[PDB]
Symmetry: D2
Subunit: 295 residues, 4 copies
Amino acid sequence: SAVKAARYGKDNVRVYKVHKDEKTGVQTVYEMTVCVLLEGEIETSYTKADNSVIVATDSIKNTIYITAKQNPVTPPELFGSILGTHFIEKYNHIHAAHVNIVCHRWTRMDIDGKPHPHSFIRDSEEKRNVQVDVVEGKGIDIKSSLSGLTVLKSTNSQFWGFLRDEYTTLKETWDRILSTDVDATWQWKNFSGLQEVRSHVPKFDATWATAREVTLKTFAEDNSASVQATMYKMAEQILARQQLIETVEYSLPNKHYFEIDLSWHKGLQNTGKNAEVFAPQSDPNGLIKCTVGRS
Amino acid sequence: SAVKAARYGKDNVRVYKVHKDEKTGVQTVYEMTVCVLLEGEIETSYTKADNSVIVATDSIKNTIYITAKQNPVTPPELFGSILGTHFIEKYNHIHAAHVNIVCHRWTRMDIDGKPHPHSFIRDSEEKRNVQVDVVEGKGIDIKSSLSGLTVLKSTNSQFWGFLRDEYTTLKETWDRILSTDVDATWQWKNFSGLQEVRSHVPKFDATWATAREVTLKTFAEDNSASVQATMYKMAEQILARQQLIETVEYSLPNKHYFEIDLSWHKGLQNTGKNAEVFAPQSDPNGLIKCTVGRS
Amino acid sequence: SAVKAARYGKDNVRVYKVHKDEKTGVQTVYEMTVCVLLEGEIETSYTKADNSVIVATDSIKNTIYITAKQNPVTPPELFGSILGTHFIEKYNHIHAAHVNIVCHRWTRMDIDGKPHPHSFIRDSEEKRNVQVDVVEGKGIDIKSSLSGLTVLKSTNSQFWGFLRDEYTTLKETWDRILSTDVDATWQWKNFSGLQEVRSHVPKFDATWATAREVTLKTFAEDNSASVQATMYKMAEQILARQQLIETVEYSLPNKHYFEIDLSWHKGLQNTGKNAEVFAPQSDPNGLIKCTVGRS
Amino acid sequence: SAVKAARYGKDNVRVYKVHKDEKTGVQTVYEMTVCVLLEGEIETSYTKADNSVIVATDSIKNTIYITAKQNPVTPPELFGSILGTHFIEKYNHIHAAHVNIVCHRWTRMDIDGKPHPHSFIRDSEEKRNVQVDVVEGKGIDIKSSLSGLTVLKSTNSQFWGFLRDEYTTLKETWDRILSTDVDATWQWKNFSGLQEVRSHVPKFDATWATAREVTLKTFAEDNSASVQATMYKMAEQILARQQLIETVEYSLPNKHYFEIDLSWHKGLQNTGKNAEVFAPQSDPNGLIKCTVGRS
Ligand SMILES: O=c1[nH]c(=O)c2nn[nH]c2[nH]1
Ligand SMILES: O=c1[nH]c(=O)c2nn[nH]c2[nH]1
Ligand SMILES: O=c1[nH]c(=O)c2nn[nH]c2[nH]1
Ligand SMILES: O=c1[nH]c(=O)c2nn[nH]c2[nH]1
Ligand code: NA
Ligand code: NA
Ligand code: NA
Ligand code: NA
Ligand SMILES: [Xe]
Ligand SMILES: [Xe]
Ligand SMILES: [Xe]
Ligand SMILES: [Xe]
């Protein structure tokens, strides 16, 4: 037998950082969960019990806190690139670092119509994420994403004209509820190293904001022919607005809400045009994916 | 042996209802999870296998959907009172109904600064809840609550002057992070029945809004001497603003964020006034409760 | 306003303890999650910002580890009684301690038919729990429980003869699946203090084992007329086998498995006597409770 | 823009099947959660709102139940292969099916030392899984796995001789706790189609059993030099015992248990050789992976 692939490191490292403006007294907080996995010339730790090649996972955890102390943690694309670059430059035998960051929302509170200097609210479990792969001699590959964005529209979704055969019971519809949890990922062109990532720093927050805005607007305004058709429209617009993105991937559950026939009870009408009360279904769910790239 | 207490019913009933304004085209959605448990002269179903006394839990589920079809579902205090009253009036041998409702957020989307007529976002896992106990000949007891409201302030929290003995290692502090998930419950004076609940309908949404506003403002503005002292201030204000409330209960975790000493690494300063990077602790957590009532 | 009730302390304290037999080399591990909440003359911490009355929650956490170091942690009824007694005896102004313990399973591995001296497996998320309330001058009240015991029988469950009215759609059945997660609690007679709890130490593990055995046997062997009837039989037997128990409480979900009609597809028969494939339902679920005591 | 990749289908389809032996009266239950995603000539549903190419996800759900009705559901490798083959053969324009199955434990109860004919217990959240990719003209690729197997050993784990630099605080140790949740995957050689999968049916359950047995034995008996070294030993043995496996992958968290220094309290000794009480850490955790293949 032989080691074909190996990676190891520290997962679920929770980090909080505060920035304090001494001039204005305004404080800003960032909270993230970080995972760092390394690859390189480490096979002998598995095959020969040779720990001399292992940067202890506890040391990786220390390094994450030290790096956060000495560098900005925003945008997360920059922080992940700095963190991953550190490991491949510091250790001769480590040749790749894989950094995943989940950013948690701490939104400044408005108290009496004014932004509060040091109080925050978690408005939703929506996350902003990055995956940064730093590979020695191959640059920095970054995938940025938003996840956990849960939306519903109560009309202006349709689904008809699908294949009907002896396995089909679903009725065609011209008016249904559509609800999903949005997972959207945009993949940046490969960067040659940290200097190039630094040169594009303003694009990271702007592109996140654009991806979010396009998702919400398209969902709300599209008279949707299917999840497939609506998600394609989203991906097309994001690619049009940011030339440094190579691909956009969406993964969308179709969270079903079923009509409830109440006609057995005193002829009560609660289907089709009379549908008012529905039963949200926890499972099963449709799952629709697509990756859109350039011609 | 004898049956000392018994209750049974249906839990985790998910319900969605849509309201459509034909004039404006505006749609409004409500989604809830409902539990109904009944009590009464039902001992023989346990002791003698006498199912004749059992209103099937499946029928309870049907009744919830039928009631939602025929009545408003908001405010939830009113809907729960209607639902509970139904069971004690319909069935001679059922003498109490216990209704718990969790309301999920579907907040209307703003697209280009304008409220969208039929698209919604789940902005946070914060819930608005009710517990309604309808007891034949004893009226309607309602407890209203908010839960899952997660907040953090990065300064203006202190904790010093506590008991110090041979079990104590905690250092006094004049500047710490304070973060919690707020669970707040206000208990209404007993209502004689549905007519009285109906007469107070406008107070339910207003009092929820007041409880939320007081919680957020007090948390943000109090230079907190302890969780205990801050929560008391919240409860005091709510009782002052709504005379029909008898008690206010708060249950608050103290979600700890620990300083990280980095001085072992090149004398890096990250404690006390130099603290920038902290480690959020998943467990253990302080848990502080109090119930405040009138003199 | 006035403080009507207050309690505070530390939740989610994870504790592991190992016992090492030096003679045999056999090691035994215990892992628990502990919560301790205190009550007493502590109102002024809420109303006057007087922290002098507060035993810091961090100190409570220390005390839990110190107590586990110096005392056996099994049976959990004994450990909880020792822990709660400590707080009311140590602190003049603390008059009640409320201790909740969840015990996690670490079951010794069998390797080649022989019990291993120091290796363990988590066989199921079933828990053994205690709630211990130690109240100065009122003794020690203990409720013991098992929870998270998930079972299913594929036949020998029936449900017919229930109330049928205009809200009823459920068909009577003489053969259905019955599946539940068992939550069972037995409440001990009040103990005068630690000496009396110590005198009954052997009864705690034996009664847990009896409660588990009776639950499993009765579930498997009863030709069940309803959840209600089967659970009563369980509670009756436990009370008969242990005179120091005053009440037994069961709380059982009815986790539904629905038939799937496949007759629309080539006349496929999958209902009633031909039912083979079913759809487990995640929600809603029946919920049935009862508390059984002595005549 | 262009569609670079697309797949869609139904996730979280819960299925239960019962087998009844009419001779012996013994019943056997199987419960699974199934996901099926399809690929093929479906781009136009995304780009042109052409639903004619879509096999509705609701129809996929129907097909899963119908297939379970007409075929054995065990071993899951066989069931997944049948299910995936169905879609690529039935639909001209569908060219790949991706089937994921999670099998849930329902273990027959022993009542009074005898196996019960129709009563079952969920002994642990450990799963047996398969991933089956059926690609037209490229055969059937199957990855089998076990996951959620949680183990702990209280001694006979060491970790010393790792890289020490200015980021390192971890002390070397010759005696520590080791606990993990095992995720192990074995990848079968490519099969040409259903006939070949059928010819190897007995190997699937046997290899699962071998993988489980090797994992448990090696974990319990290895005087572990690191997670890396122990996991390699496991993978090596599995490959030696089943020639039709090409690779074995393990992904293991290192779930840390920290010593608690209690010396500040009356010189209490609870570290090194005197360590009895430990603090399980919920996060962060080490994460160690490796893929082992043949020379
Ligand atoms: O087994 C281990 N492997 C590792 O890589 C490691 N790093 N810290 N502790 C560790 N333990
Ligand atoms: O055992 C049962 N008890 C009940 O009360 C019930 N209601 N519907 N199905 C049921 N099954
Ligand atoms: O606000 C607090 N209240 C408390 O009771 C406590 N105990 N430790 N830290 C604390 N902080
Ligand atoms: O938008 C949808 N896309 C689909 O593929 C599908 N299948 N059933 N319902 C559906 N809705
Ligand atoms: Na390197
Ligand atoms: Na009544
Ligand atoms: Na006392
Ligand atoms: Na095909
Ligand atoms: Xe969508
Ligand atoms: Xe607070
Ligand atoms: Xe039961
Ligand atoms: Xe391991």
